[PDB]
Each structure stands twice: as structure tokens, then as C-alpha cells.
PDB file of N, CA, C and O in Angstrom:
ATOM      1  N   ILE H   1     343.192  95.083  89.400  1.00 56.04           N
ATOM      2  CA  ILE H   1     341.861  95.121  88.812  1.00 56.04           C
ATOM      3  C   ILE H   1     340.859  94.475  89.756  1.00 56.04           C
ATOM      4  O   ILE H   1     341.015  93.315  90.133  1.00 56.04           O
ATOM      5  N   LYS H   2     339.827  95.226  90.131  1.00 58.23           N
ATOM      6  CA  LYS H   2     338.812  94.727  91.044  1.00 58.23           C
ATOM      7  C   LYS H   2     337.477  95.373  90.720  1.00 58.23           C
ATOM      8  O   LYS H   2     337.418  96.528  90.286  1.00 58.23           O
ATOM      9  N   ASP H   3     336.402  94.613  90.935  1.00 58.51           N
ATOM     10  CA  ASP H   3     335.069  95.201  90.931  1.00 58.51           C
ATOM     11  C   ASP H   3     334.892  96.178  92.084  1.00 58.51           C
ATOM     12  O   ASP H   3     333.925  96.949  92.090  1.00 58.51           O
ATOM     13  N   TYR H   4     335.793  96.143  93.060  1.00 58.17           N
ATOM     14  CA  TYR H   4     335.841  97.116  94.135  1.00 58.17           C
ATOM     15  C   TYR H   4     335.806  98.527  93.553  1.00 58.17           C
ATOM     16  O   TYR H   4     336.676  98.879  92.743  1.00 58.17           O
ATOM     17  N   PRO H   5     334.827  99.348  93.919  1.00 58.43           N
ATOM     18  CA  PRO H   5     334.685 100.663  93.288  1.00 58.43           C
ATOM     19  C   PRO H   5     335.832 101.592  93.654  1.00 58.43           C
ATOM     20  O   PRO H   5     336.637 101.331  94.549  1.00 58.43           O
ATOM     21  N   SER H   6     335.893 102.701  92.922  1.00 56.31           N
ATOM     22  CA  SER H   6     336.875 103.756  93.147  1.00 56.31           C
ATOM     23  C   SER H   6     336.196 105.114  93.101  1.00 56.31           C
ATOM     24  O   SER H   6     336.677 106.046  92.450  1.00 56.31           O
ATOM     25  N   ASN H   7     335.071 105.245  93.795  1.00 57.16           N
ATOM     26  CA  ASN H   7     334.211 106.409  93.658  1.00 57.16           C
ATOM     27  C   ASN H   7     334.622 107.519  94.612  1.00 57.16           C
ATOM     28  O   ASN H   7     335.034 107.263  95.746  1.00 57.16           O
ATOM     29  N   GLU H   8     334.507 108.758  94.137  1.00 55.46           N
ATOM     30  CA  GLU H   8     334.832 109.935  94.928  1.00 55.46           C
ATOM     31  C   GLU H   8     333.846 111.047  94.609  1.00 55.46           C
ATOM     32  O   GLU H   8     333.254 111.096  93.528  1.00 55.46           O
ATOM     33  N   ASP H   9     333.682 111.948  95.573  1.00 53.95           N
ATOM     34  CA  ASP H   9     332.853 113.143  95.437  1.00 53.95           C
ATOM     35  C   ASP H   9     333.710 114.319  95.900  1.00 53.95           C
ATOM     36  O   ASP H   9     333.668 114.711  97.069  1.00 53.95           O
ATOM     37  N   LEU H  10     334.487 114.882  94.977  1.00 53.28           N
ATOM     38  CA  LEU H  10     335.465 115.918  95.281  1.00 53.28           C
ATOM     39  C   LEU H  10     335.114 117.206  94.537  1.00 53.28           C
ATOM     40  O   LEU H  10     334.059 117.324  93.909  1.00 53.28           O
ATOM     41  N   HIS H  11     336.022 118.178  94.607  1.00 50.10           N
ATOM     42  CA  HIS H  11     335.752 119.555  94.189  1.00 50.10           C
ATOM     43  C   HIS H  11     336.483 119.871  92.886  1.00 50.10           C
ATOM     44  O   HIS H  11     337.622 120.347  92.906  1.00 50.10           O
ATOM     45  N   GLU H  12     335.810 119.619  91.765  1.00 52.05           N
ATOM     46  CA  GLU H  12     336.234 120.061  90.433  1.00 52.05           C
ATOM     47  C   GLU H  12     337.731 119.847  90.217  1.00 52.05           C
ATOM     48  O   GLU H  12     338.517 120.787  90.098  1.00 52.05           O
ATOM     49  N   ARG H  13     338.109 118.568  90.212  1.00 56.39           N
ATOM     50  CA  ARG H  13     339.509 118.181  90.065  1.00 56.39           C
ATOM     51  C   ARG H  13     340.166 118.902  88.895  1.00 56.39           C
ATOM     52  O   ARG H  13     341.180 119.590  89.063  1.00 56.39           O
ATOM     53  N   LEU H  14     339.590 118.763  87.700  1.00 56.53           N
ATOM     54  CA  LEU H  14     340.112 119.388  86.484  1.00 56.53           C
ATOM     55  C   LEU H  14     341.521 118.906  86.156  1.00 56.53           C
ATOM     56  O   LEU H  14     342.322 119.645  85.578  1.00 56.53           O
ATOM     57  N   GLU H  15     341.834 117.661  86.515  1.00 55.26           N
ATOM     58  CA  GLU H  15     343.153 117.106  86.240  1.00 55.26           C
ATOM     59  C   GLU H  15     343.056 115.797  85.468  1.00 55.26           C
ATOM     60  O   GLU H  15     341.979 115.417  84.998  1.00 55.26           O
ATOM     61  N   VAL H  16     344.184 115.098  85.342  1.00 56.68           N
ATOM     62  CA  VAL H  16     344.311 113.985  84.408  1.00 56.68           C
ATOM     63  C   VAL H  16     343.945 112.642  85.032  1.00 56.68           C
ATOM     64  O   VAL H  16     343.813 111.649  84.296  1.00 56.68           O
ATOM     65  N   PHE H  17     343.758 112.580  86.355  1.00 55.78           N
ATOM     66  CA  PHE H  17     343.472 111.314  87.031  1.00 55.78           C
ATOM     67  C   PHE H  17     342.387 110.522  86.309  1.00 55.78           C
ATOM     68  O   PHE H  17     342.514 109.307  86.107  1.00 55.78           O
ATOM     69  N   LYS H  18     341.314 111.202  85.898  1.00 58.18           N
ATOM     70  CA  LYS H  18     340.273 110.532  85.127  1.00 58.18           C
ATOM     71  C   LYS H  18     340.824 110.024  83.802  1.00 58.18           C
ATOM     72  O   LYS H  18     340.481 108.926  83.359  1.00 58.18           O
ATOM     73  N   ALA H  19     341.685 110.812  83.153  1.00 60.99           N
ATOM     74  CA  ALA H  19     342.268 110.374  81.893  1.00 60.99           C
ATOM     75  C   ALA H  19     343.316 109.299  82.123  1.00 60.99           C
ATOM     76  O   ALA H  19     343.501 108.421  81.272  1.00 60.99           O
ATOM     77  N   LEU H  20     344.012 109.357  83.260  1.00 62.77           N
ATOM     78  CA  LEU H  20     344.911 108.272  83.637  1.00 62.77           C
ATOM     79  C   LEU H  20     344.157 106.952  83.715  1.00 62.77           C
ATOM     80  O   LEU H  20     344.508 105.979  83.037  1.00 62.77           O
ATOM     81  N   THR H  21     343.105 106.907  84.531  1.00 60.37           N
ATOM     82  CA  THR H  21     342.306 105.696  84.677  1.00 60.37           C
ATOM     83  C   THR H  21     341.374 105.456  83.496  1.00 60.37           C
ATOM     84  O   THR H  21     340.660 104.447  83.484  1.00 60.37           O
ATOM     85  N   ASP H  22     341.370 106.348  82.509  1.00 61.13           N
ATOM     86  CA  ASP H  22     340.462 106.290  81.377  1.00 61.13           C
ATOM     87  C   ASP H  22     341.019 105.477  80.219  1.00 61.13           C
ATOM     88  O   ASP H  22     340.666 105.736  79.063  1.00 61.13           O
ATOM     89  N   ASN H  23     341.894 104.516  80.496  1.00 63.02           N
ATOM     90  CA  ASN H  23     342.614 103.807  79.451  1.00 63.02           C
ATOM     91  C   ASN H  23     342.570 102.308  79.703  1.00 63.02           C
ATOM     92  O   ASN H  23     342.624 101.861  80.853  1.00 63.02           O
ATOM     93  N   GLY H  24     342.469 101.540  78.624  1.00 64.68           N
ATOM     94  CA  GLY H  24     342.555 100.092  78.700  1.00 64.68           C
ATOM     95  C   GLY H  24     341.392  99.394  79.372  1.00 64.68           C
ATOM     96  O   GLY H  24     341.547  98.261  79.846  1.00 64.68           O
ATOM     97  N   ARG H  25     340.228 100.034  79.422  1.00 64.37           N
ATOM     98  CA  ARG H  25     339.026  99.442  79.994  1.00 64.37           C
ATOM     99  C   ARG H  25     338.123  98.960  78.865  1.00 64.37           C
ATOM    100  O   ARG H  25     337.929  99.672  77.873  1.00 64.37           O
ATOM    101  N   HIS H  26     337.610  97.734  78.991  1.00 66.12           N
ATOM    102  CA  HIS H  26     336.746  97.191  77.949  1.00 66.12           C
ATOM    103  C   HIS H  26     335.459  96.571  78.486  1.00 66.12           C
ATOM    104  O   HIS H  26     334.419  96.617  77.822  1.00 66.12           O
ATOM    105  N   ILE H  27     335.514  95.995  79.682  1.00 66.20           N
ATOM    106  CA  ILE H  27     334.382  95.229  80.189  1.00 66.20           C
ATOM    107  C   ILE H  27     333.323  96.179  80.748  1.00 66.20           C
ATOM    108  O   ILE H  27     333.559  97.373  80.946  1.00 66.20           O
ATOM    109  N   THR H  28     332.129  95.630  80.987  1.00 66.37           N
ATOM    110  CA  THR H  28     330.936  96.440  81.216  1.00 66.37           C
ATOM    111  C   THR H  28     331.082  97.347  82.434  1.00 66.37           C
ATOM    112  O   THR H  28     330.923  98.567  82.330  1.00 66.37           O
ATOM    113  N   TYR H  29     331.358  96.769  83.607  1.00 68.21           N
ATOM    114  CA  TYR H  29     331.394  97.588  84.816  1.00 68.21           C
ATOM    115  C   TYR H  29     332.498  98.635  84.746  1.00 68.21           C
ATOM    116  O   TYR H  29     332.363  99.716  85.334  1.00 68.21           O
ATOM    117  N   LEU H  30     333.582  98.336  84.026  1.00 68.94           N
ATOM    118  CA  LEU H  30     334.647  99.314  83.830  1.00 68.94           C
ATOM    119  C   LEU H  30     334.099 100.599  83.227  1.00 68.94           C
ATOM    120  O   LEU H  30     334.162 101.665  83.845  1.00 68.94           O
ATOM    121  N   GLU H  31     333.558 100.510  82.010  1.00 70.89           N
ATOM    122  CA  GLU H  31     332.986 101.687  81.372  1.00 70.89           C
ATOM    123  C   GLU H  31     331.845 102.265  82.194  1.00 70.89           C
ATOM    124  O   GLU H  31     331.705 103.491  82.276  1.00 70.89           O
ATOM    125  N   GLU H  32     331.044 101.405  82.831  1.00 70.64           N
ATOM    126  CA  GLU H  32     329.931 101.883  83.643  1.00 70.64           C
ATOM    127  C   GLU H  32     330.415 102.882  84.678  1.00 70.64           C
ATOM    128  O   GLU H  32     330.079 104.066  84.618  1.00 70.64           O
ATOM    129  N   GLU H  33     331.258 102.425  85.604  1.00 71.07           N
ATOM    130  CA  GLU H  33     331.734 103.308  86.662  1.00 71.07           C
ATOM    131  C   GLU H  33     332.568 104.451  86.095  1.00 71.07           C
ATOM    132  O   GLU H  33     332.430 105.604  86.525  1.00 71.07           O
ATOM    133  N   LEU H  34     333.412 104.156  85.100  1.00 70.48           N
ATOM    134  CA  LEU H  34     334.301 105.166  84.536  1.00 70.48           C
ATOM    135  C   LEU H  34     333.519 106.366  84.026  1.00 70.48           C
ATOM    136  O   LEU H  34     333.734 107.498  84.473  1.00 70.48           O
ATOM    137  N   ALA H  35     332.605 106.141  83.087  1.00 71.88           N
ATOM    138  CA  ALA H  35     331.808 107.248  82.590  1.00 71.88           C
ATOM    139  C   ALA H  35     330.674 107.624  83.532  1.00 71.88           C
ATOM    140  O   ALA H  35     329.955 108.584  83.249  1.00 71.88           O
ATOM    141  N   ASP H  36     330.481 106.889  84.631  1.00 72.00           N
ATOM    142  CA  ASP H  36     329.739 107.456  85.748  1.00 72.00           C
ATOM    143  C   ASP H  36     330.513 108.603  86.376  1.00 72.00           C
ATOM    144  O   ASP H  36     329.910 109.569  86.856  1.00 72.00           O
ATOM    145  N   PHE H  37     331.844 108.521  86.369  1.00 68.90           N
ATOM    146  CA  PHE H  37     332.627 109.652  86.857  1.00 68.90           C
ATOM    147  C   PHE H  37     332.553 110.867  85.949  1.00 68.90           C
ATOM    148  O   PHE H  37     333.254 111.848  86.224  1.00 68.90           O
ATOM    149  N   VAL H  38     331.756 110.840  84.877  1.00 66.10           N
ATOM    150  CA  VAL H  38     331.497 112.073  84.152  1.00 66.10           C
ATOM    151  C   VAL H  38     330.882 113.065  85.121  1.00 66.10           C
ATOM    152  O   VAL H  38     330.104 112.696  86.013  1.00 66.10           O
ATOM    153  N   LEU H  39     331.260 114.328  84.982  1.00 63.58           N
ATOM    154  CA  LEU H  39     330.744 115.339  85.888  1.00 63.58           C
ATOM    155  C   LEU H  39     329.399 115.891  85.438  1.00 63.58           C
ATOM    156  O   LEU H  39     328.879 116.808  86.082  1.00 63.58           O
ATOM    157  N   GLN H  40     328.837 115.356  84.353  1.00 61.60           N
ATOM    158  CA  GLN H  40     327.528 115.740  83.834  1.00 61.60           C
ATOM    159  C   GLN H  40     327.435 117.227  83.516  1.00 61.60           C
ATOM    160  O   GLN H  40     326.332 117.758  83.349  1.00 61.60           O
ATOM    161  N   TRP H  41     328.567 117.918  83.429  1.00 60.30           N
ATOM    162  CA  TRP H  41     328.569 119.304  82.990  1.00 60.30           C
ATOM    163  C   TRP H  41     328.385 119.383  81.481  1.00 60.30           C
ATOM    164  O   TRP H  41     328.214 118.378  80.787  1.00 60.30           O
ATOM    165  N   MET H  42     328.429 120.608  80.979  1.00 65.99           N
ATOM    166  CA  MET H  42     328.387 120.878  79.553  1.00 65.99           C
ATOM    167  C   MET H  42     329.770 121.135  78.969  1.00 65.99           C
ATOM    168  O   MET H  42     329.876 121.459  77.781  1.00 65.99           O
ATOM    169  N   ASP H  43     330.823 120.993  79.767  1.00 71.80           N
ATOM    170  CA  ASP H  43     332.163 121.387  79.358  1.00 71.80           C
ATOM    171  C   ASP H  43     332.931 120.223  78.745  1.00 71.80           C
ATOM    172  O   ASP H  43     332.688 119.053  79.054  1.00 71.80           O
ATOM    173  N   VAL H  44     333.857 120.563  77.848  1.00 72.87           N
ATOM    174  CA  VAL H  44     334.780 119.600  77.265  1.00 72.87           C
ATOM    175  C   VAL H  44     336.211 120.111  77.249  1.00 72.87           C
ATOM    176  O   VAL H  44     337.125 119.356  76.913  1.00 72.87           O
ATOM    177  N   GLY H  45     336.438 121.372  77.627  1.00 72.77           N
ATOM    178  CA  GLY H  45     337.737 122.005  77.483  1.00 72.77           C
ATOM    179  C   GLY H  45     338.874 121.285  78.175  1.00 72.77           C
ATOM    180  O   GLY H  45     340.038 121.512  77.833  1.00 72.77           O
ATOM    181  N   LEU H  46     338.569 120.424  79.146  1.00 71.82           N
ATOM    182  CA  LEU H  46     339.618 119.626  79.769  1.00 71.82           C
ATOM    183  C   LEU H  46     340.256 118.693  78.747  1.00 71.82           C
ATOM    184  O   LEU H  46     341.481 118.675  78.583  1.00 71.82           O
ATOM    185  N   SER H  47     339.436 117.913  78.051  1.00 74.95           N
ATOM    186  CA  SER H  47     339.892 117.041  76.980  1.00 74.95           C
ATOM    187  C   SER H  47     338.688 116.672  76.130  1.00 74.95           C
ATOM    188  O   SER H  47     337.575 116.555  76.647  1.00 74.95           O
ATOM    189  N   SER H  48     338.918 116.490  74.829  1.00 78.61           N
ATOM    190  CA  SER H  48     337.856 116.158  73.888  1.00 78.61           C
ATOM    191  C   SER H  48     338.044 114.777  73.270  1.00 78.61           C
ATOM    192  O   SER H  48     337.595 114.535  72.147  1.00 78.61           O
ATOM    193  N   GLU H  49     338.697 113.872  73.983  1.00 81.32           N
ATOM    194  CA  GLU H  49     339.005 112.539  73.495  1.00 81.32           C
ATOM    195  C   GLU H  49     337.950 111.551  73.990  1.00 81.32           C
ATOM    196  O   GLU H  49     336.891 111.941  74.494  1.00 81.32           O
ATOM    197  N   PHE H  50     338.228 110.258  73.819  1.00 78.95           N
ATOM    198  CA  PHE H  50     337.324 109.179  74.221  1.00 78.95           C
ATOM    199  C   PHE H  50     336.009 109.266  73.448  1.00 78.95           C
ATOM    200  O   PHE H  50     334.925 109.395  74.016  1.00 78.95           O
ATOM    201  N   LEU H  51     336.129 109.204  72.126  1.00 78.14           N
ATOM    202  CA  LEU H  51     334.986 109.276  71.226  1.00 78.14           C
ATOM    203  C   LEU H  51     334.597 107.933  70.635  1.00 78.14           C
ATOM    204  O   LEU H  51     333.408 107.627  70.540  1.00 78.14           O
ATOM    205  N   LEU H  52     335.575 107.123  70.228  1.00 76.33           N
ATOM    206  CA  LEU H  52     335.264 105.805  69.686  1.00 76.33           C
ATOM    207  C   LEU H  52     334.611 104.922  70.741  1.00 76.33           C
ATOM    208  O   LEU H  52     333.731 104.109  70.430  1.00 76.33           O
ATOM    209  N   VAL H  53     335.035 105.065  71.997  1.00 78.73           N
ATOM    210  CA  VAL H  53     334.384 104.336  73.079  1.00 78.73           C
ATOM    211  C   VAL H  53     332.895 104.641  73.105  1.00 78.73           C
ATOM    212  O   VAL H  53     332.078 103.760  73.391  1.00 78.73           O
ATOM    213  N   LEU H  54     332.514 105.879  72.781  1.00 76.76           N
ATOM    214  CA  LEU H  54     331.102 106.246  72.770  1.00 76.76           C
ATOM    215  C   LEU H  54     330.347 105.479  71.695  1.00 76.76           C
ATOM    216  O   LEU H  54     329.322 104.845  71.977  1.00 76.76           O
ATOM    217  N   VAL H  55     330.836 105.524  70.453  1.00 75.52           N
ATOM    218  CA  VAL H  55     330.172 104.802  69.375  1.00 75.52           C
ATOM    219  C   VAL H  55     330.199 103.301  69.624  1.00 75.52           C
ATOM    220  O   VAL H  55     329.425 102.559  69.012  1.00 75.52           O
ATOM    221  N   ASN H  56     331.073 102.832  70.518  1.00 77.48           N
ATOM    222  CA  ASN H  56     331.017 101.428  70.916  1.00 77.48           C
ATOM    223  C   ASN H  56     329.820 101.155  71.820  1.00 77.48           C
ATOM    224  O   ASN H  56     329.129 100.144  71.651  1.00 77.48           O
ATOM    225  N   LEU H  57     329.554 102.040  72.778  1.00 77.23           N
ATOM    226  CA  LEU H  57     328.470 101.816  73.721  1.00 77.23           C
ATOM    227  C   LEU H  57     327.113 101.969  73.038  1.00 77.23           C
ATOM    228  O   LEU H  57     326.982 102.612  71.993  1.00 77.23           O
ATOM    229  N   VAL H  58     326.094 101.357  73.642  1.00 76.45           N
ATOM    230  CA  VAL H  58     324.737 101.436  73.111  1.00 76.45           C
ATOM    231  C   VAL H  58     323.750 101.953  74.155  1.00 76.45           C
ATOM    232  O   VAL H  58     323.115 102.994  73.951  1.00 76.45           O
ATOM    233  N   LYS H  59     323.612 101.251  75.281  1.00 72.75           N
ATOM    234  CA  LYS H  59     322.608 101.610  76.276  1.00 72.75           C
ATOM    235  C   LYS H  59     323.128 102.646  77.266  1.00 72.75           C
ATOM    236  O   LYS H  59     322.468 103.664  77.514  1.00 72.75           O
ATOM    237  N   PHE H  60     324.289 102.381  77.868  1.00 75.22           N
ATOM    238  CA  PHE H  60     324.969 103.425  78.620  1.00 75.22           C
ATOM    239  C   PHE H  60     325.161 104.654  77.748  1.00 75.22           C
ATOM    240  O   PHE H  60     324.980 105.786  78.205  1.00 75.22           O
ATOM    241  N   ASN H  61     325.528 104.446  76.483  1.00 72.83           N
ATOM    242  CA  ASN H  61     325.612 105.554  75.542  1.00 72.83           C
ATOM    243  C   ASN H  61     324.283 106.293  75.454  1.00 72.83           C
ATOM    244  O   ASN H  61     324.255 107.524  75.347  1.00 72.83           O
ATOM    245  N   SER H  62     323.170 105.560  75.511  1.00 74.11           N
ATOM    246  CA  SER H  62     321.860 106.199  75.441  1.00 74.11           C
ATOM    247  C   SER H  62     321.612 107.071  76.664  1.00 74.11           C
ATOM    248  O   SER H  62     321.313 108.264  76.537  1.00 74.11           O
ATOM    249  N   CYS H  63     321.738 106.496  77.856  1.00 77.21           N
ATOM    250  CA  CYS H  63     321.555 107.296  79.062  1.00 77.21           C
ATOM    251  C   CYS H  63     322.690 108.284  79.300  1.00 77.21           C
ATOM    252  O   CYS H  63     322.651 109.013  80.295  1.00 77.21           O
ATOM    253  N   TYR H  64     323.691 108.315  78.423  1.00 74.72           N
ATOM    254  CA  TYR H  64     324.863 109.171  78.559  1.00 74.72           C
ATOM    255  C   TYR H  64     324.816 110.393  77.650  1.00 74.72           C
ATOM    256  O   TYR H  64     325.019 111.519  78.114  1.00 74.72           O
TER     257      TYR H  64
END
């Protein structure tokens, strides 16, 4: 666990790596960077989970 980022700019992964790292995060920068890795598309067909985390967020949830 590090504040050291894990950012990438790749070509439509469409795999579970995001869902792999999408677990057990609670602190601010965790969710910040994690849902920064949202692809900002309109699609959900990959997975439709991670909903309670949304109702937990407030401001990131707003800009999200």
C-alpha cells in the first residue's frame, strides 16, 4: 500500500484488473485514483457492481 500512483493510459483493457484492484479501499486517495480510472464512457456491460461505494461518496460522487 502506497500513495505512489498506479496510473496507466492503455487501450480499452476490458478486463478484471480494475475489479481486482477495486476491492478493500476505504481512504480518500484510494477511491480518488481508483474511480479516476473510470473510462468516462457510457458503458457498464463489463460489470455493474460498486454501487454502495457511490452512495458513500459525496463530492467525488458529485463530480463523478
